[PDB]
Design a protein around this ligand. Sequence first.
Ligand SMILES: *[C@@H]1O[C@H](CO)[C@@H](O)[C@H](O)[C@H]1NC(C)=O
Ligand SMILES: *[C@@H]1O[C@H](CO)[C@@H](O)[C@H](O)[C@H]1NC(C)=O
Ligand SMILES: N[C@@H](Cn1oc(=O)[nH]c1=O)C(=O)O
Ligand SMILES: N[C@@H](Cn1oc(=O)[nH]c1=O)C(=O)O
Lengths: 765, 765
Amino acid sequence: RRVVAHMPGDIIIGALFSVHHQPTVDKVHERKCGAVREQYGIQRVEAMLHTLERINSDPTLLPNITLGCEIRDSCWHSAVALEQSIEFIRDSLKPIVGVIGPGSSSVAIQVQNLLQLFNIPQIAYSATSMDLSDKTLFKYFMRVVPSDAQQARAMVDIVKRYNWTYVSAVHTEGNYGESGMEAFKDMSAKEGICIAHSYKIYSNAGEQSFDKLLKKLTSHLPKARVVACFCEGMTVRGLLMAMRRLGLAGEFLLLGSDGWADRYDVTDGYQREAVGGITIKLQSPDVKWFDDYYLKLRPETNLRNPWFQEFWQHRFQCRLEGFPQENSKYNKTCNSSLTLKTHHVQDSKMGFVINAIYSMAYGLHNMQMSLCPGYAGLCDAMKPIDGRKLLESLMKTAFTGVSGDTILFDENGDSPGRYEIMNFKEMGKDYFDYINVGSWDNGELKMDDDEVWSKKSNIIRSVCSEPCEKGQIKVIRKGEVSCCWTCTPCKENEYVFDEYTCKACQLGSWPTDDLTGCDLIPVQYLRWGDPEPIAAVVFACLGLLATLFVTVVFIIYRDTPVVKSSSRELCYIILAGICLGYLCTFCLIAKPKQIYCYLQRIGIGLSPAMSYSALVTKTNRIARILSACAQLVIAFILICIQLGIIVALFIMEPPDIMHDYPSIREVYLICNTTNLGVVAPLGYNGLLILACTFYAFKTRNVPANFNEAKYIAFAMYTTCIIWLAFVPIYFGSNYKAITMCFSVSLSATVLLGCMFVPKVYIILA
Amino acid sequence: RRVVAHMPGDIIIGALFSVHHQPTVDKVHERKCGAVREQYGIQRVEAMLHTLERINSDPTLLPNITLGCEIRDSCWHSAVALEQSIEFIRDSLKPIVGVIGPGSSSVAIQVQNLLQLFNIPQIAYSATSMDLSDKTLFKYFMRVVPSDAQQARAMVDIVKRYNWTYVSAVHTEGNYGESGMEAFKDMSAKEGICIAHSYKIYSNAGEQSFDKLLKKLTSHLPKARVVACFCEGMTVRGLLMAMRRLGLAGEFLLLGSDGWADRYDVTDGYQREAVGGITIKLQSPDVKWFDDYYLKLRPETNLRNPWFQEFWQHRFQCRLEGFPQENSKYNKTCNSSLTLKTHHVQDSKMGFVINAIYSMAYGLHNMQMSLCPGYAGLCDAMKPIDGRKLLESLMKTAFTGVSGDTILFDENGDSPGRYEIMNFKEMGKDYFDYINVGSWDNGELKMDDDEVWSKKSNIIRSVCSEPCEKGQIKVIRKGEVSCCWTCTPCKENEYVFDEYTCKACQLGSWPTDDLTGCDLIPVQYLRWGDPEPIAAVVFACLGLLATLFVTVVFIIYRDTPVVKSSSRELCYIILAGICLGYLCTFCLIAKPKQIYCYLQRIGIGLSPAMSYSALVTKTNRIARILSACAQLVIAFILICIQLGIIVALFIMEPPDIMHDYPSIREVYLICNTTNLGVVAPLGYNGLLILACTFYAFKTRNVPANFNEAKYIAFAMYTTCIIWLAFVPIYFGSNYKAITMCFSVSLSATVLLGCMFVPKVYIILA
Ligand SMILES: *[C@@H]1O[C@H](CO)[C@@H](O)[C@H](O)[C@H]1NC(C)=O
Ligand SMILES: *[C@@H]1O[C@H](CO)[C@@H](O)[C@H](O)[C@H]1NC(C)=O
Ligand SMILES: N[C@@H](Cn1oc(=O)[nH]c1=O)C(=O)O
Ligand SMILES: N[C@@H](Cn1oc(=O)[nH]c1=O)C(=O)O
């Protein structure tokens, strides 16, 4: 039978403390507990005994009634605690009025499911799972610590403070780990944080299980460098031991939980592996009087605590001869010089443990105040202490704590509390410590970024993909969590619509700077500058100068017989046409406008048709003579025919500015001239040429005034070749305007020359 | 205190049945449970009370000993069953040697946690959760049913059989539901399925909770019409009542589980809302001998069942006056003609229950054979029947069940089984029934897709997005779920790499039909024939005919005095040049090959070089005379110079066919004749032409033999412009071959016809 610590009194309060370690994986069925525990074990039993004797000593608390206790060992296992709890309720089948419940959430649940049936209030000090807040299933459960709803929030705040996104989660199998990791997963996923993969493990699992878990964790090593452990202390120690076994000394940052806190017994010997880990610890000041009472204990006199001599021997590895408990396993003997004052480490949850004992005390006081206000003691109205009344009194009680605050329970049975942030750092050489690098209260996280990462090179941000909003490149998912993206650049005509897709611009549009939006690329006109068209305009100007010189010479020598043989009007009509060619070239090269672009048509129609019409009549007259003024009229009508066709093409295609986009980039504006709108006048001009071919062959060479027929027959001859050669370039090209300009002013000069010069040259000579 | 059914015996076996319904949410703390049950309650009580008689009347099983029982009421509740289990184990503080576990997985876990402390084996008949298969924590627990693992697969198979991709998930709060939904989520997300959202709810929740759950379920209604309930019977009934309240009559198809099975009590009164639902039932044939005993039971004689009178009054709504259990709540009085034969339904899991007790019988039989073979009864080494030995002999028991099959426990305490897929249909007019429409066994899902949906217009498949495999389009996930995608059309250039990305083809390439792959586009070239080459080659052929005619006239009249002039050999060189130029095109306008394109450049380089150089020498002699046979010497060398440049341009750029791609759509092939490879021969030719233009202008009009020098005075004067006219066309175009073809023959023609034809002319004259 398991041993039990007793203390007499009028009212007896049960307490479950984990004096011994959890049963090993291969001895769960035997329910055999491992080694004794100091922080979680003997210290808590001593705290309970001393605080109860203090309560008995205090006259102002529970006067004239002495509080007893029955402390049992829970071994941090569900079955052992369940059997001890059955032992608690055995009399109810002096009764236990209340239990200072176990420190594990799963164990607390298992004990509560049994205690609630017999109306036994249970006050926990370390069980912090959210599930215990449900008063429908756990009516007889209270705690002096906050739930894990705030601890998960604190962990999420820590991960979101340091840009950590792609973390990996581990939690111990059990209610505490399960609930905590569920809360963390829920809160983090709503705030952009990410989980590579969530793992679970038992605290008592063998070395092989931890090795496998660490292998799975290293499977994401380059990217998921932060591990979030809603783990217990022994789970974290197992992870550290795995790191030691398979050579890992800084590949991970373990973001611990309340289980780890600042426990020195999870990093003993493995400090090098745990350096840089961040943990969350329930805020609890050191208790002075407990330290004063505890360090003065000796195994010779400490007979109340049945485990104490065993503790002595396991702690100071030695054996105590003059006692039953010798245990020769330990070679040497315990000299009367050992004391607990050396390397003494008070457990973090020592404030809470005492508080949970005061609660059940104060809750018993208040209930005694109401039941029998006058009587100072155990009144006859209190012989069968009622569990329901005691629970009610505990729910509405409030008292000053050991720390110096007020402990009180809300409607959910929980109690207010704040958290502390610790960083396990290497302070000196071969010396490590937990350093307080922040806190967390009522939703407000106030860290200290200087103490942790005393440099600008903090831990590599746990991210899956680098920030890739770098202009052209967009972000595409890969069928996994919306966490790890591949970055793809869209084409040049596409701009980023969102961070997720890239959208093409319009027909004549181009994306702006930073590809945030788009832009209608400006139209391109025929510029007056440039090296090419300046030559064309210079040529046109020279042609105009030649034409004005020609007209001056023609009018000065007006009535001379050497020029008064042919019609003066005919070779003034030709002059008007040759001038109109240059005028058409000049008005062609400009901004294509609703006022400008139809002059192109009139030029290209009349100029290369009307001049040849005036010429053909003269050639025919000279040929057939080898008449009168009537040849003028037949000339004019020959113009009018062409004047029809242009007008014929004017109706179907009105003068407008049409935009063409030969490529997706450049935009051009030109008049609406089409394939049919340039061939028909050119077709007629071909006929004009054809007409004069007839004559030119017939005339050939004829001795006239200055042998005009010798030269006028040749000006046409050099024109038809260029007219034909112009077709291939014009048909396929992007330079229609300049080509038209050069064509017109080319066949132009030719004519103006032999037409007039041969005559007017020698005339002036 | 609660009542309990008793039967005396040497060995006592307890049981936990939900005789009454779960306590309502407003009376859980009092632990008073609701109305009586027929299938899950009284029927199983009578099953135990008669199976024990059947065993006790069989000398072949447990001879000369009697099996008593202590049947307790668990009210389908964890707390009530834990209290009753405390009552069971109170003796160990006649002992209970083992129990028939409760029907609920959570309740089974709770009672196992207490029973394993006292080595009391527990056998379950419906506790199907896969949590209890862990023998580390649940050693003394066995069951005659498979795990939920198999059942979750059965569902996954069902959902993947009917294209159902986007479904909703609901499970009952507890272990059964939670474990089942975890398994289903795992093996569904792994294969192809996507869950819109997973919900949970307690069975004993209020109306408002179920209404809220249904409101959340209709949030995804247009897409996810299928809800997967790893829920309990009463959870499904609550869902149906919610559907009735807010007017849903066929928006959802409920995919139920073992909880639902073919229970008429979950779909009574609410058939309209459940029609079409598909449920999974553990297969167990109805035990025939149970009916012939049960149906003849009467409340007058059945005194050993404390719950029989309550049930009898609850079933036929009336009162039994002649009995203490009057229950004056009802109005009328039961006549002595009411029988259980009317509206009798035996529960699905009756055989299981029976087999469970049989499992305990043989375990208690195989023990007594092994412990004391000689004795027929309770031997001395068996008076304190060992729980450990009972469990050991139980795990290895193989026997025959009431169904006729063989019952045997695996290494984890489970037993094999198969599933029946049932469909709730409207058979007649106002008549609804469950129809067996399939089965599932070890991975084989047999089903009858015609009994359900006797048509092709089944339930609108629970899908999110329509298929995107419409050729060009591809799938884009927005970072929501992996089953709701948009369709993006790829451009005509790229081909679909996978379902989710499409990548561009090679620059010379094109996607094949259906965008499945990319194929090599065929190359184009200037084919023999065609519209323009058929006109171009006519020029070359006519030129060759003219050149042969002219050379015939030249060689015939070589010695005629009328040609005794500037060396006829020099002009013969020119004529050979024209012939070479005419044959240049025939190796130019063809299919590009190394043989053709190592001579094309030679031709263009030399043909307009050597002929023109010989013309230069001839005109040089003519001009300087106003020499001897050395003219060839000063001529020939010039040719070499040009040849040198060609050779200079041949070494740097070897003749090879390279593929030119004006755009992605078109492909051509041509040799490596580049811009730099054309200017240099053209530069030399232009320099030569300009050099001889001076002498051509010097000659002008010189009276020579038959005006020989006159024609070449002006004919050459044309060869400049046409060559010049060739320069732009060759630069900006895609027809660089045919342009060269036309230009080469167009140059010679003139020079040829005006230096070798006037000759033929006067030769004839
Ligand atoms: C990322 O963390 C840094 C501090 O390490 C700080 O800038 C901030 O918390 C995060 N960055 C942004 C842009 O918020
Ligand atoms: C969807 O289900 C049908 C029959 O229910 C069958 O074609 C197949 O299982 C699914 N469709 C495809 C294309 O796989
Ligand atoms: N917070 C834990 C309690 N706890 O876990 C440890 O590892 N130490 C410790 O006190 C729980 O809620 O169970
Ligand atoms: N199979 C369930 C139990 N169960 O719940 C019901 O509603 N019916 C029923 O048999 C389980 O494994 O817990």
